Amino acid sequence: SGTILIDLSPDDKEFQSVEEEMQSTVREHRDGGHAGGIFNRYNILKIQKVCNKKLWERYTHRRKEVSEENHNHANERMLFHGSPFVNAIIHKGFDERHAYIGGMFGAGIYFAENSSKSNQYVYGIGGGTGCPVHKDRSCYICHRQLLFCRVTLGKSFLQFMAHSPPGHHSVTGRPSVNGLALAEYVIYRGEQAYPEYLITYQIMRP
Ligand SMILES: [Zn+2]
């Protein structure tokens, strides 16, 4: 592996930026905490910057290709990712080959602009079994991990699929009175995202 994790001082403005974004994007969900647990705040334990030259060159290369297909604009956004695979991803990069067939927008890798949404997916689809130790989707004890990722969206198709629709690079899923409540984002190519910050945390009891 080429990956090294550099720990950030809570003193650091880089930490405080990611901390602020994570806490501020939390929302009350429709499921009543069923999937991700009940909370309005996290206990931010550790923020590490992920450094891999090969993984970075994979990303910046793809980003250039998208820009030339999208009027010299990458449409780069910083978004959250949640999944069982976080420990794999920080070493090997995103891999679409492990994408899940069932999922509102087909076999892609899902992202959120709301940390609380991405949280729901950490122990699997709709929380799965919950935490390995207590089998509790609302565990306040077991430490969790999200990624705060640099994601190249390109020309994003809006919608309420194996790949992107033609002439598009992503899908922006959108709120729907009989569908989504917040925005999802989906890529169909692992090189269109970089896992930049690894966040270790727990959800807090009100
Ligand atoms: Zn637990």
Numbering used by the authors: 951 to 1110, 1115 to 1160
Sentences copied from the publication:
Tankyrase 1 and tankyrase 2 (TNKS1/2) are members of the PARP family of enzymes that control protein activities, interactions, and turnover through mono- or poly-ADP-ribosylation. TNKS1/2 regulate a number of target proteins, including AXIN1 and AXIN2 (AXIN1/2) in the β-catenin destruction complex resulting in WNT/β-catenin signaling pathway inhibition, and AMOT proteins in the Hippo signaling pathway resulting in YAP signaling inhibition. Tankyrases, through their ankyrin repeat clusters, bind to AXIN1/2, making AXIN1/2 accessible for ADP-ribosylation by the C-terminal TNKS1/2 catalytic domain. We have previously developed tankyrase inhibitors bearing a 1,2,4-triazole moiety and binding predominantly to the adenosine binding site of the tankyrase catalytic domain.
Lead compound OM-1700 (13) within the novel series displays high potency and specificity and has overall favorable ADME properties compared to benchmark tankyrase inhibitors. As a consequence, in the following optimization campaign, the South 2-chlorophenyl moiety was replaced with the 2-fluorophenyl group of 23 resulting in acceptable efficacy compared to other substitutions. The binding mode of compound 13 in cocrystal structures was similar, and the hydrogen bonds to the backbone amides seen in the 1 cocrystal structures were retained. A water molecule forms bridging interactions between the pyridine nitrogen and Gly1058 and Tyr1050, and the same applies to all the cocrystal structures described. However, compounds with this naphthyridine moiety were less stable in microsomes relative to the corresponding East-pyridines, and consequently, 13 was short-listed for mouse pharmacokinetics studies.
